Design a protein around this motif. Structure first.
Motif, PDB file in Angstrom:
ATOM      1  N   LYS B   1      -1.861 -25.845 -74.564  1.00 43.95           N
ATOM      2  CA  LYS B   1      -2.026 -24.682 -73.703  1.00 43.95           C
ATOM      3  C   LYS B   1      -2.760 -25.058 -72.421  1.00 43.95           C
ATOM      4  O   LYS B   1      -3.209 -24.183 -71.676  1.00 43.95           O
ATOM      5  CB  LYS B   1      -2.791 -23.576 -74.435  1.00 43.95           C
ATOM      6  N   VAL B   3      -1.324 -26.765 -69.879  1.00 47.32           N
ATOM      7  CA  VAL B   3      -0.396 -26.505 -68.789  1.00 47.32           C
ATOM      8  C   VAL B   3      -0.307 -25.008 -68.522  1.00 47.32           C
ATOM      9  O   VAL B   3      -0.285 -24.573 -67.367  1.00 47.32           O
ATOM     10  CB  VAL B   3       0.983 -27.120 -69.100  1.00 47.32           C
ATOM     11  CG1 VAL B   3       1.864 -27.083 -67.874  1.00 47.32           C
ATOM     12  CG2 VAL B   3       0.830 -28.550 -69.603  1.00 47.32           C
ATOM     13  N   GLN B   4      -0.247 -24.200 -69.582  1.00 50.53           N
ATOM     14  CA  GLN B   4      -0.206 -22.754 -69.388  1.00 50.53           C
ATOM     15  C   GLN B   4      -1.463 -22.263 -68.686  1.00 50.53           C
ATOM     16  O   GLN B   4      -1.394 -21.402 -67.808  1.00 50.53           O
ATOM     17  CB  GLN B   4      -0.040 -22.033 -70.730  1.00 50.53           C
ATOM     18  CG  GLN B   4       1.335 -22.170 -71.357  1.00 50.53           C
ATOM     19  CD  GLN B   4       1.420 -23.327 -72.324  1.00 50.53           C
ATOM     20  OE1 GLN B   4       0.835 -24.388 -72.098  1.00 50.53           O
ATOM     21  NE2 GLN B   4       2.141 -23.125 -73.422  1.00 50.53           N
ATOM     22  N   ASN B   5      -2.620 -22.816 -69.050  1.00 44.84           N
ATOM     23  CA  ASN B   5      -3.863 -22.379 -68.433  1.00 44.84           C
ATOM     24  C   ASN B   5      -3.903 -22.754 -66.958  1.00 44.84           C
ATOM     25  O   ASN B   5      -4.373 -21.971 -66.125  1.00 44.84           O
ATOM     26  CB  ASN B   5      -5.056 -22.982 -69.172  1.00 44.84           C
ATOM     27  CG  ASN B   5      -6.340 -22.233 -68.899  1.00 44.84           C
ATOM     28  OD1 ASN B   5      -7.107 -22.596 -68.004  1.00 44.84           O
ATOM     29  ND2 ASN B   5      -6.576 -21.169 -69.663  1.00 44.84           N
ATOM     30  N   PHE B   7      -1.240 -23.122 -64.988  1.00 42.40           N
ATOM     31  CA  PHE B   7      -0.325 -22.155 -64.375  1.00 42.40           C
ATOM     32  C   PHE B   7      -1.033 -20.842 -64.100  1.00 42.40           C
ATOM     33  O   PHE B   7      -0.984 -20.324 -62.985  1.00 42.40           O
ATOM     34  CB  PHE B   7       0.865 -21.973 -65.325  1.00 42.40           C
ATOM     35  CG  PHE B   7       1.898 -20.981 -64.875  1.00 42.40           C
ATOM     36  CD1 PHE B   7       2.478 -21.060 -63.625  1.00 42.40           C
ATOM     37  CD2 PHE B   7       2.326 -19.991 -65.740  1.00 42.40           C
ATOM     38  CE1 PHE B   7       3.450 -20.155 -63.239  1.00 42.40           C
ATOM     39  CE2 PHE B   7       3.302 -19.096 -65.364  1.00 42.40           C
ATOM     40  CZ  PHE B   7       3.865 -19.171 -64.111  1.00 42.40           C
ATOM     41  N   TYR B   8      -1.696 -20.288 -65.116  1.00 46.48           N
ATOM     42  CA  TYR B   8      -2.457 -19.051 -64.961  1.00 46.48           C
ATOM     43  C   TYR B   8      -3.466 -19.140 -63.821  1.00 46.48           C
ATOM     44  O   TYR B   8      -3.537 -18.247 -62.963  1.00 46.48           O
ATOM     45  CB  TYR B   8      -3.152 -18.756 -66.291  1.00 46.48           C
ATOM     46  CG  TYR B   8      -3.960 -17.493 -66.331  1.00 46.48           C
ATOM     47  CD1 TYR B   8      -3.344 -16.253 -66.263  1.00 46.48           C
ATOM     48  CD2 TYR B   8      -5.338 -17.532 -66.478  1.00 46.48           C
ATOM     49  CE1 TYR B   8      -4.075 -15.090 -66.319  1.00 46.48           C
ATOM     50  CE2 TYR B   8      -6.079 -16.370 -66.536  1.00 46.48           C
ATOM     51  CZ  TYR B   8      -5.439 -15.151 -66.460  1.00 46.48           C
ATOM     52  OH  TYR B   8      -6.169 -13.977 -66.509  1.00 46.48           O
ATOM     53  N   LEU B  28       3.631 -28.649 -61.294  1.00 53.36           N
ATOM     54  CA  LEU B  28       3.150 -28.533 -62.657  1.00 53.36           C
ATOM     55  C   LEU B  28       4.314 -28.679 -63.627  1.00 53.36           C
ATOM     56  O   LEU B  28       4.190 -29.315 -64.666  1.00 53.36           O
ATOM     57  CB  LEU B  28       2.454 -27.184 -62.863  1.00 53.36           C
ATOM     58  CG  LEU B  28       1.738 -26.985 -64.202  1.00 53.36           C
ATOM     59  CD1 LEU B  28       0.646 -28.016 -64.403  1.00 53.36           C
ATOM     60  CD2 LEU B  28       1.157 -25.579 -64.281  1.00 53.36           C
ATOM     61  N   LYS B  29       5.444 -28.076 -63.268  1.00 51.73           N
ATOM     62  CA  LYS B  29       6.641 -28.132 -64.102  1.00 51.73           C
ATOM     63  C   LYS B  29       7.161 -29.565 -64.155  1.00 51.73           C
ATOM     64  O   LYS B  29       7.540 -30.067 -65.217  1.00 51.73           O
ATOM     65  CB  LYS B  29       7.738 -27.224 -63.564  1.00 51.73           C
ATOM     66  CG  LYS B  29       8.769 -26.797 -64.579  1.00 51.73           C
ATOM     67  CD  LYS B  29       8.325 -25.654 -65.449  1.00 51.73           C
ATOM     68  CE  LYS B  29       9.357 -25.279 -66.493  1.00 51.73           C
ATOM     69  NZ  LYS B  29       8.959 -24.295 -67.541  1.00 51.73           N
TER      70      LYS B  29
END
Lengths: 55, 52
Positions: B1, B3-5, B7-8, B28-29
């Motif tokens: 998580k 990468v998700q963080n 992104f957020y 990021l992707k």
């Protein structure tokens, strides 16, 4: 590129919806990253939730 | 998580313009292993673009 731009734009709108709490914003954003093809549905759900939480 | 963080947090930075924010998300992707470096770069740019 199209999906990344879509989630970037939709994600920015979601995190700026003023009546959502931080966990709600974070959950929508995590869902956006997990399945970018749901961006329109997630944005619409987030906006509706935002409106139901108006002062 | 991680990468998700990142992104957020990138989406939350108020002083990025749309092109800049989109470019960070694309980076990021493209290379999620660089999430911490990209977030730090984005934060630096955000602070430099504070209204004066």
């Amino acid at each position: 590129n199209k999906f990344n731009k879509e989630i970037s734009v939709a994600g920015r709108e979601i995190v700026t919806l003023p009546n959502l709490n931080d966990p709600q914003k974070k959950a929508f954003v995590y869902s956006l990253w997990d399945d970018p093809s749901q961006s329109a549905n997630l944005l619409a759900e987030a906006k509706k939730l935002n409106d139901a939480q108006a002062p």
